Each structure stands twice: as structure tokens, then as C-alpha cells.
Write an enzyme that holds these catalytic residues in place. Structure first.
Site, PDB file in Angstrom:
ATOM      1  N   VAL A  10       7.299 -12.864   2.487  1.00 23.46           N
ATOM      2  CA  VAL A  10       8.242 -13.850   1.947  1.00 23.46           C
ATOM      3  C   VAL A  10       9.275 -14.242   3.010  1.00 23.46           C
ATOM      4  O   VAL A  10      10.157 -13.450   3.399  1.00 23.46           O
ATOM      5  CB  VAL A  10       8.947 -13.327   0.659  1.00 23.46           C
ATOM      6  CG1 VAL A  10       9.884 -14.402   0.084  1.00 23.46           C
ATOM      7  CG2 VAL A  10       7.912 -12.861  -0.399  1.00 23.46           C
ATOM      8  N   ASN A  12      11.923 -17.559   4.577  1.00 25.76           N
ATOM      9  CA  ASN A  12      12.920 -18.500   4.085  1.00 25.76           C
ATOM     10  C   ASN A  12      12.334 -19.839   3.729  1.00 25.76           C
ATOM     11  O   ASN A  12      12.775 -20.508   2.806  1.00 25.76           O
ATOM     12  CB  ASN A  12      14.052 -18.684   5.093  1.00 25.76           C
ATOM     13  CG  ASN A  12      14.914 -17.460   5.188  1.00 25.76           C
ATOM     14  OD1 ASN A  12      15.707 -17.176   4.290  1.00 25.76           O
ATOM     15  ND2 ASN A  12      14.725 -16.692   6.251  1.00 25.76           N
ATOM     16  N   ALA A 107      12.771  -7.205   6.892  1.00 23.88           N
ATOM     17  CA  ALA A 107      11.512  -6.527   6.542  1.00 23.88           C
ATOM     18  C   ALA A 107      10.348  -7.052   7.358  1.00 23.88           C
ATOM     19  O   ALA A 107       9.411  -6.319   7.627  1.00 23.88           O
ATOM     20  CB  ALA A 107      11.219  -6.635   5.076  1.00 23.88           C
ATOM     21  N   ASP A 108      10.433  -8.307   7.794  1.00 20.57           N
ATOM     22  CA  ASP A 108       9.381  -8.872   8.628  1.00 20.57           C
ATOM     23  C   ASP A 108       9.283  -8.221  10.015  1.00 20.57           C
ATOM     24  O   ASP A 108       8.209  -7.968  10.516  1.00 20.57           O
ATOM     25  CB  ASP A 108       9.538 -10.394   8.749  1.00 20.57           C
ATOM     26  CG  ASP A 108      10.896 -10.828   9.333  1.00 20.57           C
ATOM     27  OD1 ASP A 108      11.931 -10.114   9.252  1.00 20.57           O
ATOM     28  OD2 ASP A 108      10.907 -11.945   9.886  1.00 20.57           O
ATOM     29  N   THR A 131      10.593 -18.961  11.520  1.00 17.52           N
ATOM     30  CA  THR A 131      11.792 -19.693  11.090  1.00 17.52           C
ATOM     31  C   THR A 131      12.838 -19.487  12.139  1.00 17.52           C
ATOM     32  O   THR A 131      13.472 -20.426  12.602  1.00 17.52           O
ATOM     33  CB  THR A 131      12.306 -19.175   9.724  1.00 17.52           C
ATOM     34  OG1 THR A 131      11.252 -19.249   8.773  1.00 17.52           O
ATOM     35  CG2 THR A 131      13.550 -19.988   9.194  1.00 17.52           C
TER      36      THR A 131
END
Lengths: 248, 248
Positions: A10, A12, A107-108, A131
Site C-alpha cells: 500500500v 500513497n 514498511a516498504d 512515489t
């Protein structure tokens, strides 16, 4: 048996949904994250994409940098799969997190570092062109920190929005030494310039830490792949990290 | 006699107002550009700043990158000084505008090139660190083009706005190889990274066109001069260009 897993990243702007039955081959899709999305809306979007695979899912793992979306994913997992998802987070173990506040790291990036240590070894520099464009350093299985700059699309959009006269330019590397119109000026400054920025941060890293291998990943990495010297190109690094973190 | 001239640099976020009697020394003020400002509002803002000097103004010269502001400046000049302003524009003369559409180059950059060729020579590289960070090349009196990237504040704000989790960070150079918290990661990527971007673009210009002198200017340029190799540091470059173009 080879249980099927849904791995979710997930972001942005976009969310990645991927299924694996082995943790080496991943089928993947991408949806906008949106705002006010619901679990039924998520199910509806995924239904014709996953097809029959949807009913085989035995576990859901998620790395998310959008806390607002998290109860949607939780609700989706419980309603449609009668399970709670597993959430990627920095925790103690085989990765040492040598930074002021490990719980603050996205978390990414946690997922990238997990996948790295698991698949590529103990020493490395990870460039994630998404992003944001992120640089992350792993030394002797310790996460040492990194750098963040605006991603390519973020940059061209910022110039378009923050200015009366600048157009929104399509991200494409420059092949000239100076630009001869506005569009060229921005391709050169944003695309070629961000590549120089990265080459520069990596350089200083390598002077202090050695000659670590470089892995490139991210939604925006394909366009400039060749332009940065790298040992590994792996578009699935983050989703691999979710898989390894949650399902080992 | 030494007639007083008002020089104006209208930018997307700020407008610079400066007075000179000689085009060699300048007094300057800076104001937000605002939206929907009127000529009376401008006069009201300038009145306690310019003070007695306001009566002595004999000419108004303007470089603007915000077309919607221009009618305000025109009306201010005519109402309070009974003159029309002189508008900085690329035209034939001492500079050869060797790009696709000269009328499309920002008046701020036009003024920088005019000041450089008038003041510093026929050969050079101009770095203007403001709303955007701009690179411009002049070779044998011919403007050859350049690069545009987001400025420092534009970058840190783009990360804050375009992200759920990232803070808005104060711009300040990194004294470290990797950041150990979010704020440090951003400083390294945006500030140091932009310096690297600039160095790489300039480097490639130098390879092609030889060792050209470099001028640094702009409102975000102070913090970073000790990081870029430059032969000239001149914060008045744009205002000087305005003066030279309009008043000779």
C-alpha cells in the site's frame, strides 16, 4: 502443498496486490490507492483480476505507508477471507535496525531490507524509485539508514503545480547536454539530475563503506534502469519482503 | 544626476522590490506575491518600506514569471508614478537566444543572462537556486539553454504533501553519509542530492564546452555556496539584469 498468499504493498499513490504459491514466482496487479475506498470496492476491483485464484488465498501480508487504508485492508481480509492480515513492521531478529527510531521507517523500506538480507546477502545499497526515491544501506545485516528525495513524477508535478508557466512534463531521460525548450530543461533537471543525485549519494556511501552491490527497484525504475550502475534489478523486492516477513 | 529606478522580480511565491540610483548598489525588500493583490495593496505594503525614496522613483523595470500579476504591476506604475513599466523579455541585442522559443524562457532567466553578459563575460554557467533551481549556459554571448529542477523548499514540501507519513523538513545540508532518522534522510536526499544533481549537469556541460566560470545566485543559494564550486556569488544577479535591460 503450496498455499497461495496475497501480498499487498500500500503506497500513497498506488497499491500493489500480488499472489504467490512458492515465494519465488509472483503474479501482480496494481490499483490506485484512492481515498474512501472500502473493502467491497477493493473486492470488486480484484474480482475479475484474480479470477478463480481469489478463492485459493490462505494468508494476507501487507506493507503499508498509508495508515488510513489499513482498516480497509483489515476489513477486506476478515470479510472475504475470514483472516487478519500480517503487517510488515521493523522488529528485532536477523535484521539489526541501527537508526534512531526503527519503528518510524516505512514498511516498504523494511520489506526491501528483509528481502535483501534473505535473498542477496548481508551488504547492499537499495534504490527504490517510487512515489519517493529512497536509498537504503545494509551493512553486515544491519540497516544503517538512507536518503529520501521526491520521486520523478513528484518532481515534474511539483514544478507544474508550484509555478504559473511550467508545463507538466512526461518523465523521459534527456539525451542532450542542455535543454532547448522548457520540456527539455525539465527532463534534464529532474530525470538526469535525479540520476546524478543518486550516483552521488551512492558514491559517498561507497567511500565510507566499501563497494557494496546496488539493487534497483520501484515503479519508476524501469525508465532509467541502464543509467545507474547496478548489480541487481528486482521489481519484486518489496513484495518479496512482505512474503518473507509474513510467511517466512 | 542619479535618477532612482525601481526594479521588480515577480516570482511564483515572492516578489523582490529593489531601488538603485546607479545600478551598482541596490536596496532590496521581498514580499509574498499573493493572489488577487491590487495596485493599492502593493502601494500600501511598500509605503513604510520605501519611505521617502518612493517619491524619487523615475523608472520601473520588471521581470515577471507570473502573468496574472503583470496587470497589477502595470496599474501600480501608472497610478502611483504615471509611467508604464519596462518588461524584461528575450530580444536580439548583446545576447543571442539560441533555443527553440526564446519568448518562452522565464524573464528571470533572461535577466540573469543579460546581467552576466553585461557584467561577467561572454562565457558562463548560471545557477539560480529559487522556486525552481535553474541552470543556464552562455557560450560566446549566445544563450544555449539549460536545466530546471524543483528548488529546495519545493522538494521538501512535495514530500510532505504527496505522502501520508513524511514530515515537512527544514532545509539544511547533511553532515553525514546516511540519515539515521526521517528528517536526516530528507536533508541528505534533497539538499546534498540537489548539489550532486547540479554538479553532474555542470560537469557534463564542462565536458562539452570547456571550463566555464560558474555564478551562483538566488534566494535559496546561501546555504549551499560552500558546497558548489563557483567563481562568482552574486545575489543581485536578477535585479542587475532588470536594471541593465531596462535602464542601460
Amino acid at each position: 502443498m503450496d498455499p497461495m498468499y496475497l501480498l499487498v504493498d500500500v503506497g500513497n499513490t498506488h497499491s500493489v496486490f500480488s499472489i504467490t504459491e512458492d515465494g519465488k514466482t509472483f503474479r501482480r496487479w496494481r490499483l490506485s490507492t484512492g481515498v474512501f475506498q472500502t473493502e467491497d470496492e477493493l473486492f470488486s476491483h480484484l474480482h475479475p483480476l484474480l479470477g478463480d485464484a481469489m478463492r485459493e488465498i490462505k494468508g494476507i501480508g501487507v506493507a503499508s505507508v498509508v495508515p488510513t487504508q489499513n482498516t480497509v485492508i483489515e476489513r477486506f481480509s476478515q470479510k472475504y477471507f475470514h483472516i487478519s492480515p500480517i503487517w510488515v513492521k521493523a522488529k528485532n531478529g536477523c535484521v539489526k535496525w541501527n537508526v534512531k527510531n526503527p519503528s518510524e521507517v516505512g514498511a516498504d523500506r523494511v520489506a526491501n531490507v528483509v528481502a535483501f538480507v534473505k535473498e542477496y546477502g548481508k551488504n547492499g545499497i537499495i534504490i527504490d524509485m517510487g512515489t519517493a526515491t529512497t536509498v537504503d544501506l545494509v551493512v553486515n545485516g544491519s540497516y544503517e539508514g538512507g536518503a529520501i528525495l521526491p520521486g520523478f513524477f513528484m518532481m515534474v508535478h511539483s514544478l507544474f503545480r508550484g509555478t504559473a508557466k511550467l508545463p507538466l512534463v512526461e518523465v523521459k531521460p534527456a539525451d542532450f547536454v542542455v535543454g532547448k525548450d522548457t520540456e527539455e530543461n525539465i527532463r534534464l533537471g529532474v530525470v538526469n539530475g535525479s540520476v546524478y543525485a543518486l550516483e552521488g549519494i551512492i558514491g559517498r556511501i561507497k567511500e565510507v563503506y566499501g563497494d557494496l552491490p546496488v539493487v534497483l527497484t520501484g515503479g519508476q525504475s524501469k525508465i532509467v534502469k541502464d543509467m545507474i550502475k547496478h548489480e541487481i534489478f528486482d521489481e519484486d523486492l518489496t513484495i518479496k519482503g512482505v512474503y518473507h516477513f509474513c510467511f517466512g
